[PDB]
């Protein structure tokens, strides 16, 4: 029996986790009080993937909420699904990291990490067959990025053979809510590239673009962003819980999509997405889902895939459908856009189909893409990093907590090396003289 332990660090991680748990509770028909009031029998067939059982037929999610600021904890508990979580799992401190990775990783988080790992170990020892972990957080922030990377390192030390997943919100080109985003993001990438099996790559820019141009929302808020992230986060693990014609475990995705150990940064996406009034003008078919999945504007990483080539992609479909349509459509996508796919992989489209659609839809699909174009994102951060590091713009706050410049140099070098392992396998090969 596969099952996953969920962790959420920082304000962004906590918000996305709250929306995710609301979505999953609705999918499985779990009341906010924890009781079950669903209809289908299949909902309980794999409830253990995300929940533990209590005495009174109540189901407690396997969540571990961590943050150094009690305000987000109070906001989460005073909410629609605040009471669902175990109170003992609300581990937190005071005197937040203050948008400082050094405080989050070396000074303030170093004390709370013991309690966090204690709760994680308690949840892990009761597992039947632990598959992997899922950490939701943001890299450009403070306590979130630092404590997330520290927990990743500790858990990978303790559980080397388990899959690790991280859904990270990075900085963006234009929208930037914090001054010191480059340093934090750089150190976070330095940790993540070394200590993670799969990383999913999202930024606020692409979510806003999706909300405005596709969903046509006049005044989007963080709820809608977290809703989209929850949709893809549920789609990625849909195959663990419900049956299907062709199953897809997390390990299957890891094996198919990671050609080499260091290239495990993915661009997610979700389909269908329509703006209410247009819903009656569209026909829901497999070609439409494929067209919207491979559309560049639907990508959630704000990296144009047309400025690069796909090393691998995965399509997790949900709903009743014909396998011939899926195979033909993916083959057509590979053949038509021949120049946008790496050529030394004969077929670079993993496909899986689950027979249970979402609650309110006849069909749905989740797209994942490992492509070179992601380099661009790293390059942007690198530029900003050097622009702040040549003059030592905001470095004294970091060095005051015990860090040194050599760590910054290491992180910059590691990102530069990663950017290359993506170009190497890009530009079409050629001859010489």
């Amino acid at each position: 029996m596969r099952e996953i332990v969920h962790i959420q660090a920082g304000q962004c991680g906590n918000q996305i986790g709250a929306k995710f748990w609301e979505v999953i509770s609705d999918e499985h028909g779990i009341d906010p009080t924890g009781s079950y009031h669903g209809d289908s029998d299949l909902q309980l067939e794999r409830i253990n993937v995300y929940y533990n059982e209590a005495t009174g037929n109540k189901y407690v999610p396997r969540a571990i909420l961590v943050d150094l600021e009690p305000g987000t904890m109070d906001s989460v508990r005073s909410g629609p699904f605040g009471q669902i979580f175990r109170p003992d799992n609300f581990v937190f401190g005071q005197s937040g990291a203050g948008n400082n990775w050094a405080k989050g990783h070396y000074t303030e988080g170093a004390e709370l990490v013991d309690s966090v790992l204690d709760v994680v170990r308690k949840e892990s020892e009761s597992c039947d067959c632990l598959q992997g972990f899922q950490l939701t957080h943001s890299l450009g922030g403070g306590t979130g990025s630092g404590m997330g990377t520290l927990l990743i390192s500790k858990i990978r030390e303790e559980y080397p053979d388990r899959i690790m997943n991280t859904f990270s919100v990075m900085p963006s080109p234009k929208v930037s809510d914090t001054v010191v985003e480059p340093y934090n993001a750089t150190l976070s990438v330095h940790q993540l590239v070394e200590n993670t099996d799969e990383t999913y790559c999202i930024d606020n820019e692409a979510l806003y673009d999706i909300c405005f141009r596709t969903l046509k929302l006049t005044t989007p808020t963080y709820g809608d962003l977290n809703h989209l992230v929850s949709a893809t986060m549920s789609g990625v693990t849909t195959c663990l819980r419900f049956p299907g014609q062709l199953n897809a475990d997390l390990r299957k995705l890891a094996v198919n999509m990671v050609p080499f150990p260091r290239l495990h940064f993915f661009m997610p996406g979700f389909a269908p997405l329509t703006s209410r009034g247009s819903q009656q003008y569209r026909a829901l078919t497999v070609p439409e889902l494929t067209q919207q999945m491979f559309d560049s504007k639907n990508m959630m990483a704000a990296c144009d895939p047309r400025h690069g080539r796909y090393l691998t992609v995965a399509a997790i479909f949900r709903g009743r459908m014909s396998m011939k349509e899926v195979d033909e459509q993916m083959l057509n996508v590979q053949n038509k856009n021949s120049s946008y796919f790496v050529e030394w992989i004969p077929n670079n489209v993993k496909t899986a189909v689950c027979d249970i659609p979402p609650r309110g839809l006849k069909m749905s699909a989740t797209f994942i893409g490992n492509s070179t174009a992601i380099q661009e994102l790293f390059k942007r951060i690198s530029e900003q990093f050097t622009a702040m590091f040549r003059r030592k713009a905001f470095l004294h706050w970091y060095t005051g907590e015990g860090m040194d410049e050599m760590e910054f140099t290491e992180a910059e070098s590691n990102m530069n090396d990663l950017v290359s392992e993506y170009q190497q396998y890009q530009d079409a090969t050629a001859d010489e003289q």
Partner: protein, 451 residues
């Protein structure tokens, strides 16, 4: 007592087994619950045949099946499905992770600790069986448990049993269509085991079945259910000889004798002639000549390969229904008079013929039309190498840069296994190329009378 054991490994094997066992239950009149109202209504009979089903004192009939898979979900569907009472409670499910499209994981790491339990039941069935005829192993290339676990199981079965025939039904990767990136690695890796240990391997390709469904059956959007039903019909036609009476009955040993000229060329293609919808069932005669001609058409082959690019080493036709030997003889002669069908000069006979009286049955809710006659053809030819050649090409394109190798070597394998598998496949292709060559140009030395 012509009794065989059906083993199903992997998701593809399990779904194929579901379709097949539906077909056998319909054929023999056994209901899902496992009982047999036919005997109660009539009074008795041998319809509860020992070939697939074992009878107990309470009148219940249990199949001689062994379902195996690492994912709980695929067979947890079966335990909660229509046929929950048909099978034994034991279903041999590892409550652990899947092989993850990894031959090494399915063979070395997780394939252990289950191979014992599986082999123990494969015994409690063999010991219960008497006069065992053979094993029918269902799986699929390109999968983790469908490649590694099947390899380990075939190795252990060869070590233990040895002389019993082990027929293999498997799904090969298609030329264009695929549903995983690491299919070539698994398929090439398992080639050694399916070459050394299996006695005869019947191979199918999903693209060919999709084409047959689209063209002949007028199903614009097929699914795995229809392909599984077609494969089930193939297996039913194969095994119908040792269940029902017939003018000419063909056992498995005769399949091995006729379709295997040499030990390493035991890879015959298969096909089913009267694949036709109910609407097109009319306006057609479906005579013996028509089905015999349709068997040899390149379009109707179940593997995407052209027989016209190679020579036929051997052929075996199994007819079901109202068939009399005059028409099969005439059809064989008519086929022999055609130029496009080339036969190796060293096999002048080139045909095995079997006839059975029991006509094919129709699955309720299916798509095949009810017919009076049918034929299943097996064809050992040299065209199959072409398909293998395509697969070989893909492997090099993924092995030149050692992509996806760290996953395999992290579970127990080394690059030497990859090199050995590639060399073995190249040797097999060379053997297929050599055997298809004509006999020595007439060694007409023109010796003049006495030396």
């Amino acid at each position: 007592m012509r009794e065989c054991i059906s083993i199903h490994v992997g998701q593809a094997g399990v779904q194929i087994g579901n379709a097949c066992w539906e077909l056998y239950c319909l054929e023999h009149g056994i209901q899902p619950d496992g009982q047999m109202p036919s005997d109660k209504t009539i009074g008795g009979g041998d319809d509860s045949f020992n070939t697939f089903f074992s009878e107990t004192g309470a009148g219940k009939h249990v199949p001689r099946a062994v379902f195996v898979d690492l994912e709980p979900t695929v067979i947890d569907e079966v335990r909660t499905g229509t046929y929950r009472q048909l099978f034994h409670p034991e279903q041999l499910i590892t409550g652990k992770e899947d092989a993850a499209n990894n031959y090494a994981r399915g063979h070395y790491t997780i394939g252990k600790e289950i191979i014992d339990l599986v082999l123990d039941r494969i015994r409690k069935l063999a010991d219960q069986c008497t006069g065992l005829q053979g094993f029918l192993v269902f799986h699929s290339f390109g999968g983790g448990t469908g490649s590694g676990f099947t390899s380990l199981l075939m190795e252990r079965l060869s070590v233990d049993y040895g002389k019993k025939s082990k027929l293999e039904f498997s799904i090969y990767p298609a030329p264009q269509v695929s549903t995983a990136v690491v299919e070539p690695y698994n398929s090439i890796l398992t080639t050694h085991t399916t070459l050394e240990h299996s006695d005869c391997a019947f191979m199918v390709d999903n693209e060919a079945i999709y084409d047959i469904c689209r063209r002949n059956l007028d199903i614009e959007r097929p699914t795995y259910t229809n392909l599984n039903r077609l494969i089930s019909q193939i297996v039913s036609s194969i095994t119908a000889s040792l269940r029902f009476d017939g003018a000419l009955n063909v056992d498995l040993t005769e399949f091995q004798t006729n379709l295997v000229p040499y030990p390493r060329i035991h890879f015959p293609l298969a096909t089913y002639a009267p694949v036709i919808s109910a609407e097109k069932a009319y306006h057609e005669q479906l005579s013996v000549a028509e089905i015999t001609n349709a068997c040899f058409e390149p379009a109707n082959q179940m593997v995407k390969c052209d027989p016209r690019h190679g020579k036929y080493m051997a052929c075996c036709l199994l007819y079901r229904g109202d068939v009399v030997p005059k028409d099969v003889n005439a059809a064989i002669a008519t086929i022999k008079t055609k130029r496009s069908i080339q036969f190796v000069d060293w096999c002048p006979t080139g045909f095995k013929v079997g006839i059975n009286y029991q006509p094919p049955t129709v699955v309720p809710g299916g798509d095949l039309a009810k017919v009076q006659r049918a034929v299943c053809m097996l064809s050992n030819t040299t065209a199959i190498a072409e398909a293998w050649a395509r697969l070989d090409h893909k492997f090099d394109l993924m092995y030149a840069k050692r992509a996806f190798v760290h996953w395999y070597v992290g579970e127990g394998m080394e690059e030497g296994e990859f090199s050995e598998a590639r060399e073995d496949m190249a040797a097999l292709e060379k053997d297929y190329e050599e055997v298809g060559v004509d006999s020595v140009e007439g060694e007409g030395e023109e010796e003049g009378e006495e030396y």
